[PDB]
Amino acid sequence: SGFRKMAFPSGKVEGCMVQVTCGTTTLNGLWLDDVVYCPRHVICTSEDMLNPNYEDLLIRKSNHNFLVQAGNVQLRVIGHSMQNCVLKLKVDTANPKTPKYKFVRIQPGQTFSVLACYNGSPSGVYQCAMRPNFTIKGSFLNGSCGSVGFNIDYDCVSFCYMHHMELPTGVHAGTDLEGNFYGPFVDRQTAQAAGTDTTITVNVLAWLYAAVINGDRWFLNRFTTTLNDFNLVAMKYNYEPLTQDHVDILGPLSAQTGIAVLDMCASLKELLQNGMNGRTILGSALLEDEFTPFDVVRQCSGVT
Amino acid sequence: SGFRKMAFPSGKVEGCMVQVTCGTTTLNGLWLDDVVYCPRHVICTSEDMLNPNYEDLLIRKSNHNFLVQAGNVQLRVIGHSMQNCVLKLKVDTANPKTPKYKFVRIQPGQTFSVLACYNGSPSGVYQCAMRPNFTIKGSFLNGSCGSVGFNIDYDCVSFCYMHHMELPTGVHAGTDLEGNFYGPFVDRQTAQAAGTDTTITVNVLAWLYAAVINGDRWFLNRFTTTLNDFNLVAMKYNYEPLTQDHVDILGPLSAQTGIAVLDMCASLKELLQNGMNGRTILGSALLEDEFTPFDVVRQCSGVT
Ligand SMILES: Cc1ccncc1NC(=O)CN1C(=O)COc2ccc(Cl)cc21
Ligand SMILES: Cc1ccncc1NC(=O)CN1C(=O)COc2ccc(Cl)cc21
Structure with a gap:
């Protein structure tokens, strides 16, 4: 628990992180196989950043201007291209640690x-x-x-x-x-x-299920709600409207705890309307929305 | 920011994690050089756990009873010993990924x-x-x-x-x-x-400094306090008494922000006595104590 x-x-x-330097700018790059990916603004100076013409700035650069270093060793750049806002630097060595x-x-x-x-x-x-x-x-x-x-x-x-x-x-x-x-x-x-x-409603509900699994259950109540009623409350408190697809994704958590999704929605409705009255849930004094229903299931089952 | x-x-x-199995118990081990460290309760069954005689339980085990597997491959155990509550399994191969x-x-x-x-x-x-x-x-x-x-x-x-x-x-x-x-x-x-x-006072103060560095400053006030006065408040709210050694460790953060440690203590005193009035600090609705002053400095400077 x-x-x-x-x-x-x-x-x-x-194992994939490298340093990319172009001129006076140094940032990070991702080395996968024989390509290093990095933000295209590595080719800008601070003066260029107000409205850079990336196509023109990149034309002034050659393969040898891109200094790529994988910790201690230098990579040889044999090609460069811009795709949207990333640069792809082709190197002569595939990353041996490419997962x-x-x-x-x-x-x-x-x-x-x-x-x-x-x-x-x-x-x-x-x-x-x-x-x-x-x-x-x-x-x-x-x-x-x-x-x-x-x-x-x-x-x-x-x-x-x-x-x-x-x-x-x-x-x-x-x-x-x-x-x-x-x-x-x-x-x-x-x-x-x-x-x-907005607040990610499906994730707050997933986190209330994680709370029940781990013994924090003071917020559970005798009430239920409907998707329509819950969505009027979600509207008022700037929460994403709950859909049947979100209820479906919460199925496994509802099955594990025996708490119907709409009953958990009624606990969330009471928490939105009343606050937490100086109490905590899983060590938090606010409604947490950075855990998806998949994250809760993964964490509560011990997936490696 | x-x-x-x-x-x-x-x-x-x-790179150091291995699986250790002894009888029907499987747990994790740490492989550093030619030794694998794991909890000694790997030698117990569930029946043994009410009051295990570890010395006696370990005497029934030989090197070949400890199955150690580093992902895919099996390690050969050539020695075993118990040190306090850990077992140390000597293996014939030093971990090539030992940092x-x-x-x-x-x-x-x-x-x-x-x-x-x-x-x-x-x-x-x-x-x-x-x-x-x-x-x-x-x-x-x-x-x-x-x-x-x-x-x-x-x-x-x-x-x-x-x-x-x-x-x-x-x-x-x-x-x-x-x-x-x-x-x-x-x-x-x-x-x-x-x-x-108790709550780790020096870490809450470090986190209030992290908040100011990152622009959350609503909690700053016109007041100051003394160590004695602050400690009467720390006492009431079950916070660790603040010492001069804690003030010293907060020196770099006080220097960076220009906020004297006792002035930050007065902000913490007002927050303990008044609560956060429905506001947040660094996305939290409670006073956070899991960041040391070293952690804040490291995170705010970008140490690798
Ligand atoms: C300083 C910092 C902190 C956290 N994350 C990133 C950064 N760095 C940047 O944002 C770089 N940068 C500027 O500093 C200003 O001009 C820009 C315009 C466009 C783009 Cl892509 C980058 C920038
Ligand atoms: C289940 C779990 C969840 C989180 N962290 C650890 C565990 N596992 C344990 O605690 C193992 N274990 C018992 O389950 C009960 O008896 C004991 C007595 C002493 C010792 Cl050392 C271990 C145990």
């Missing part, structure tokens, strides 16, 4: 682990959710660009995120591994509206 | 990362603190025994914890890597009092 914000073991991803991997575009509300890196060296690992507005609330500093987000299914690493920037509001934005930004963001130093965010 | 409960990258520790390492006994209030494992396979990584009462609030299930806690200083892994048991209260207890339990616990299935716990 016990429930923690757990990240996937980062070993398979640590089985996939590139995936995650849905808002899904979670993943981030291996924060600086100068190609891993500094720490944390779990987070892709917000409904396609931002992530990470922990990143200057030099963290190129750090990646991922999930692991037994021996396969599905890379879903590459870090690009911090918005003026302190939140984070990035791309999938094909260089497409999540959300409306562009890789330019401009103020950028991140949409209205 | 941003502040997360970040764990150390687990790669160096994943630079140390065994350390951590102080209560210090933090570390845990790589939760099942059947010798890593399942996830999370950061936690050793509570003042020498328990840890982890996330562990049956089979997690032998999972380790550690910290990393550049290339050196300091192992500080090995998981042994869950107390009837759902909290966790374990040993240093010499097999000495943290706290008054014994490796026996008996109800065991974990002392009165």
Whole structure:
């Protein structure tokens, strides 16, 4: 028992981290097979970042301008290309530590682990959710660009995120591994509206189920609700409307605990309307939304 | 910017995890050089656990009864010995993935990362603190025994914890890597009092400094306090008394922000007495104590 914000073991991803330098800019790159992926803004100076013409900036660069170093050793760059907001540097050596991997575009509300890196060296690992507005609330500093987000299914690493920037509001934005930004963001130093965010309802309900499994049950009540009634409350409190697909994904947790999904919705309704009255749930004094129903099942079953 | 409960990258520790089986019990072991360390209760059956005579139980075991498997391959056991509550199994092969390492006994209030494992396979990584009462609030299930806690200083892994048991209260207890339990616990299935716990004051103050660095500053006030006055409040709210050694450890954070330690103590005093009035600090609705002043400095500087 016990429930923690757990990240996937980062070993398979640590083996892929490299440092990429172009001119005076150094950031992180991901070396998979004979290709190194990194944010295309590695080719900019600070002066270029207000409105960079990436196509023109990249034309001034040759393979030998991209310095790629895998810890101690230097990689030989034999090709370079830009795909959306990422650069792909072809190297003459396939990474011997390349794990089985996939590139995936995650849905808002899904979670993943981030291996924060600086100068190609891993500094720490944390779990987070892709917000409904396609931002992530990470922990990143200057030099963290190129750090990646991922999930692991037994021996396969599905890379879903590459870090690009911090918005003026302190939140984070990035791309999938094909260089497409999540959300409306562009890789330019401009103020950028991140949409209205909402709380990931299906994940809060999953976390209330994790709470019951682990013995925190004070919030359970004698009530039930309907999807319509619950959604009027979700509306008022800026929670994502609950759908039958979310109820379906919560089936395994409802089966394990014997608590019907709509009954858990009535506990969440009372918590939204009344607050937590100075009490905690799984060590938190707020409703947590960074655990998916899959995360709860994985953590509560002991999947490796 | 941003502040997360970040764990150390687990790669160096994943390389050391093995499965240890003795009879019908399987748990995790730590393979460093030519020795595998694991909880001594691997030699018990469920019947033995009410009051095991470990010396007698171990005399019934020979080297060949300890099945050690490093993922796919089997290790040959050439010696076994019990040191406090750990077994040390000498193997004929030194672990080729052994990192630079140390065994350390951590102080209560210090933090570390845990790589939760099942059947010798890593399942996830999370950061936690050793509570003042020498328990840890982890996330562990049956089979997690032998999972380790550690910290990393550049290339050196300091192992500080090995998981042994869950107390009837759902909290966790374990040993240093010499097999000495943290706290008054014994490796026996008996109800065991974990002392009165307290909140780690120096870590809450470190986290309020992390909040200011990251822009959360609503809790700052026009007041100051003294160590004596602050300690009367710490007493009432079950917080550890603050000492000059804690103020000294907070020096770098006070220097970075320009907020004197006693002025931050006055913000913490007002938060203890008034609560957070429905507001949050770094995404938390309670006062967080799982970040040491070293953790805050490391996270806010980008140490790899
Ligand atoms: C400093 C920091 C902290 C956390 N995560 C990332 C960063 N770094 C950046 O954001 C880099 N960067 C700027 O600093 C400003 O101009 C930009 C415009 C576009 C893009 Cl892609 C990057 C930038
Ligand atoms: C189940 C679980 C969940 C989380 N962490 C650990 C465990 N496992 C245990 O605690 C094993 N175990 C018992 O189950 C009961 O008897 C004991 C007495 C002493 C010692 Cl050392 C171990 C045990």
